[model samples]
Target: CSTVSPGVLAGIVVGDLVLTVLIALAVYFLGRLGTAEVLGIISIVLVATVLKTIVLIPFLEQN
Candidate 1:
């Protein structure tokens, strides 16, 4: 139980890492993916934040 905090913190770190990679990839493949994919990536990141903040913590606590 006590370990959950650190685990979630680690997840946040990993999420940040993944988001950074996504941004880099979007930049590198910008023209290939087109403008919409870039917008979609940005939207996905925002949605991920909302899910993590609103869902993950509450779900974790219930268990």
Candidate 2:
């Protein structure tokens, strides 16, 4: 029994990864990964921001 379902989160993670991989392959064929690189960086930042807000901040703010 899963107390916390990771269905949506896992889907988003996998979807992002698949898109990233496809974009990487496209860029490879087109001779570039810069655009995909930027998007990957942005996605990492967004994930970090959300994780910080939802997990890190709450964990740290307890007094």
lDDT of 2: 0.60
lDDT of 1: 0.67
Q: What are the per-residue Cα lDDT tens digits for candidate 2 across 1-63? A: 773376686577557656756766665666455555557655755675576457644654664
Taken over the whole model, the C-alpha lDDT of each candidate is 0.67, 0.60
Where does candidate 2 have its weakest 10-residue lDDT segment?
Answer: 29-38
Candidate 1 residue-wise lDDT, 10-39, digit = tens: 687578758866875777565565555567
* Residue pairs in clash, model 1: none
Say which candidate scores most in lDDT. 1
Q: What is the TM-score of each candidate against the true structure?
A: 0.38, 0.39
